Design a protein around this nucleic acid. Structure first.
Ligand SMILES: Nc1ncnc2c1ncn2[C@@H]1O[C@H](COP(=O)(O)OP(=O)(O)OP(O)(O)=S)[C@@H](O)[C@H]1O
Ligand SMILES: Nc1ncnc2c1ncn2[C@@H]1O[C@H](COP(=O)(O)OP(=O)(O)OP(O)(O)=S)[C@@H](O)[C@H]1O
Ligand SMILES: Nc1ncnc2c1ncn2[C@@H]1O[C@H](COP(=O)(O)OP(=O)(O)OP(O)(O)=S)[C@@H](O)[C@H]1O
Ligand SMILES: Nc1ncnc2c1ncn2[C@@H]1O[C@H](COP(=O)(O)OP(=O)(O)OP(O)(O)=S)[C@@H](O)[C@H]1O
Lengths: 333, 333, 333, 333
DNA sequence: TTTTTTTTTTTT
């Protein structure tokens, strides 16, 4: 009743008839050669921290993918996301933070650089409405970056009504693994960054390596393209009120799984309290090891205003004058 | 059959249709711009102790979050909570202590300043009725500050009936990590202070730094917004019974994680036995280093009643005459 | 009205009348003797990794079968499939990758050895067009190897439109166990490799053995003929820029079910970041155990450039000169 | 006008007039007394595996019946069927394997003992031609054993042309329950073994016992006469490559429904990779329990070559000398 | 007629 034994005989007619037949129902761009598929070239969007951009390898987060960040107690996993929101918003793109922990005070965020009139914030109770407000945003609109914070706090609906301390086994993962399969396949058709910053909790029963995993389930880690781990709680004291007080936290960002460039190229980053991640104070250490500034215990030798050995080393004049940044940024590139 | 490949084209109609579609099911205030979301301005409520209030930076506990306090054996973690109840109760707000240790002697508590006929005390046995009596209080009522003390002693139900020495691995954190997910997402819809004070316990296997952690688990610290640590057990002997006897403990309050202002600005506080925290003796040290009250070993030089060098330094007239505090509290801002 | 008692009396007329009866309606090769049927001889295509071809026993994936690969987080289950695409594309055969995770960046792919203008990529949304685009490809054309990435990401149609977190019991397996029954019987009339690389998620309720299974359902395993599990996360630091940084990952491929050779004959494999599976540095270890290269901690003594004890051991001369490989591959046979 | 009310009065002429009337249109071999019907004495054909031949009780599969076997992933449900094919082919019998998964590689099967130019294989697509090619073979010829593997792969005709994932409820069962009623009533007229090996898939919604059933439908079991469940996946390491490597699989065969002997009489069996089921290694565990070989941890004491405690215990001499088996297999009666 | 997914530390 049908065609006979399909012996392997590569007739280009016998492939082009099928490559005409499977487009009468599914459009013109549902099967094509990759060398004419120019959309799969990973467009890159930067992050301000040149340490993190030279750490990622390709120079920023890949577009159309999912990145997740997690680190321990008060290590600025919110601040890197806020800096990325300001970075993606600066070059003409609309973003929409949504919150879970009810954590983003706007007066803190306004000092970093993110605007306030262009942040479509939300306050969901459950994850059932906490994720469709991202779904209908992405799959309809043309936003460029939308984050959801603290994915241990997307509480499912079936125990926002019940009692306390009962059996709800896997009832977080059975929402997260399903909403990821619904959401994160319709992102590459839009090429929009989506970040889910995470938590840390511990297991029981270990003889090897890691005692610290993430909640939400294993399904989040497989779909995520670039993972970031942010650790480090040592402190630095500056010349705050010309004396010794705490003015700087110092963390460390290591990239553990990446799909565009080799991972485990960790970076080193400093941050002051309130003024966000200091990009100019970041610039000095990464220009020191390339020796475009000469590192010495008495006199930083090279250009831009005869530094010395204070604390506001370069920041006393290149925060005063712009347009010295682009001769250094592409130069260290 | 649906909308086709969603090309990135920033049409404000193509976002405004979504910003009409996602409000027919979740009301009018489920997504809006932050520049018109004036409710996220952090309402600040002070706490009487001017050293703690200048120590936080913002000037009080941020209204609508969770704060936690812990310190070692008998250092007054209860007294700062009681003083916060009195401060939130002074300006027209119903408060509700509940106990776990069965430790609040009311005759002590009446002398600090909190009333007794406006305090919804309870006696929960386990955590099962221990936090539903907080949940149905917060998520229904309009209270302004509730506390639940000693979260090491919210014993779970599954071993309030069994023998002693039974394997119950994780059965405190497996209650707390779900109880906080039930509570601390529905606090910001009422903007109500909730405090959980804590005990300190040690670990085994140490090569770096801290040998003292907290029980309850890692889920409590992440959702907590402002932490406070209370240490210090030196004593002071005053003119008690005209004699060198014990009248005063002296503790040191440090802020280790904050979300509204830079942390690690610790204060210095005194406390007398029975009279609660002493704000007047707290006032002299913080007025000394700004020299509104002049520091001298023979004669405290400035205004209000010609101090001298006794022990009741300023307290012998400002406890007897009011309207001298308004020229001091806003003046030291 | 019909034939009488069919007593067993083996007349070859009484079977040859049936073997001329049942072929006038169903062609000539619907039933024949197996010893005159040379088509059941399992034609084997290699995979480049000599550890894998000495591991599989018969020297590669057998044609006309379905293989699957699964491993934990970021262990190169994509990379072995890419190397198989390169091996099937090298000796004159058209291949067609398709994606589900929207994962394969082409700039990474062009480095391993796969061509770009001879790859029929696709971007399906649902599993509906996810598998019929494989069915119409195999059952019509004459492709030689076609893979499908991440069969846990082939979401069915009936909940690509529904809400989040609803009753959708078995709706992945109820597509997979039917589409496999429609697909995987028409492969052996064409003898074409089909690879379905997979995921890993856990169960609940365990007493014995395995807590890590696969999604998709039980039907994917049973029709699969050759299974591969790829584990391992140790690292090796090479002489990257005369610095000890990360340039080498190391996995461990084990074969757990086979139908052409005994199972459990696991293999060892290294991988560098970007150059794919390094077959050259892999060749030295499998030549060590047969001692055609003399393994010594000071001087690799045998032929081909008189190696020594560096890091680029053999690749410093056989990546510069060819035809030393065919006197080695059939030599280690 | 007809015969009157049939009063019960057992006259032998009143029975013999009916028992001559009802045979001139239905033949003589349609009704007879049981005590002379020598066909219903169940002729038994053995199975090679002596533990299975003591497990069935009657010493093999009863002829004229339909037996079926099923077990989970890779427990050798193909191998027991191939061994039964070789056992029926050994004593003068022509057999006809047919395949559904297109799974029997001939080079594996040639090692077990089944001849290759005497196996009428077929390659069906649908179940429509998949079962009539067995029907016309059984009902016409005088074949002695014929199997059809994997009855979850006999896909019906009505969706071999349709799309993927449509409403086809019970479309497998309405083929199977009808073709079994057409086929398996004409087996007692020929006394031919027919085996249908099976799969295992899981039900949803349970409160008692078994969560695992078989596909194909319910009407397979009612017509089946002997069922067998084949589980067990633990391994044994022998002296392969004078090394403890994987050379041995060990399963467990139970009989759960039988119509000639009581059920639940399971057996134990071993299988090596490539050489099939080992009958000599099967003989030792069944000869130890009747102490024809004495079980001792240091010296297997009894006859046949003064065994000792190696791994090939009996295989060092009865692999080369025959006719010591005939004084054993009848001896263990 | 077919599975889907983990969760939490305790103490010298
Ligand atoms: N706007 C701000 N003003 C002052 N200090 C801040 C501000 N934001 C953050 N910090 C502090 O600086 C650090 C950076 O913040 P985060 O890394 O986000 O803290 P955290 O450990 O992530 O806890 P979360 O996730 O914010 S609840 C922390 O130590 C904060 O206490
Ligand atoms: N009402 C009171 N009258 C007299 N002494 C008091 C009173 N309340 C507290 N104290 C003492 O003053 C100090 C302050 O109390 P706390 O810091 O609460 O003691 P503690 O170490 O916290 O133990 P807990 O948690 O209160 S049971 C302690 O040294 C108490 O012994
Ligand atoms: N083209 C590439 N460039 C740089 N690093 C790569 C590239 N491909 C893979 N890697 C890395 O090398 C390893 C091999 O990749 P994979 O095994 O495919 O990762 P994975 O664990 O399988 O996750 P998936 O399935 O690819 S999303 C991983 O650690 C990747 O981060
Ligand atoms: N000819 C062979 N050569 C090597 N190994 C074999 C061969 N036949 C079977 N095996 C292996 O030995 C075991 C017995 O085979 P089977 O019982 O057929 O496996 P299975 O679980 O039944 O899967 P199926 O039914 O064959 S698809 C399995 O673990 C096979 O991997």
């Amino acid at each position: 009743e049908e065609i006979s034994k399909k012996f392997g005989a590569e007739r280009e007619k016998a492939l082009n008839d099928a490559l005409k037949l499977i487009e009468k129902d599914f459009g013109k761009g549902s099967i094509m050669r990759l060398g004419e598929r120019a959309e799969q070239k990973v467009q890159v969007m930067s992050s301000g921290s040149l340490a993190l951009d030279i750490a990622l390898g390709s120079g920023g987060y890949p577009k159309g993918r999912i990145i997740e960040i997690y680190g321990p107690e008060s290590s600025g996993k919110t601040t890197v996301a806020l800096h990325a929101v300001a970075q993606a918003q600066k070059e003409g793109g609309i973003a929409a933070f949504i919150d879970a922990e009810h954590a983003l005070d706007p007066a803190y965020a306004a000092a970093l650089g993110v605007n306030i009139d262009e942040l479509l914030l939300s306050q969901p109770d459950s994850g059932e409405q906490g994720l469709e407000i991202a779904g209908k945003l992405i799959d309809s609109g043309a936003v460029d970056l939308v984050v959801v914070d603290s994915v241990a706090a997307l509480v499912p609906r079936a125990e926002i009504d019940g009692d306390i301390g009962d059996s709800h086994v896997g009832l977080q993962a059975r929402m997260m693994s399903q909403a990821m399969r619904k959401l994160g396949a319709s992102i590459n058709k839009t090429k929009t960054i989506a970040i889910f910053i995470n938590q840390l909790r511990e297991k029981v029963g270990v003889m090897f390596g890691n005692p610290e995993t993430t909640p939400g389930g294993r399904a989040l880690k497989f779909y995520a393209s670039v993972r970031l781990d942010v650790r480090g709680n040592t402190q630095i004291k500056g010349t705050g009120d010309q004396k010794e007080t705490n003015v700087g936290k110092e963390t460390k960002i290591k990239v553990v799984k990446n799909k565009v460039a080799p991972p485990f190229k960790e970076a080193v980053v400093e941050i002051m309290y309130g003024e966000g991640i200091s990009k100019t104070g970041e610039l000095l250490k990464i220009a020191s090891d390339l020796d475009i500034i000469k590192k010495a215990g008495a006199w930083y030798s090279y250009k831009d205003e005869k530094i010395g050995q204070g604390s506001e080393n370069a920041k006393k004049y290149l925060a005063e004058h712009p347009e010295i940044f682009d001769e250094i940024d592409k130069q260290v590139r």
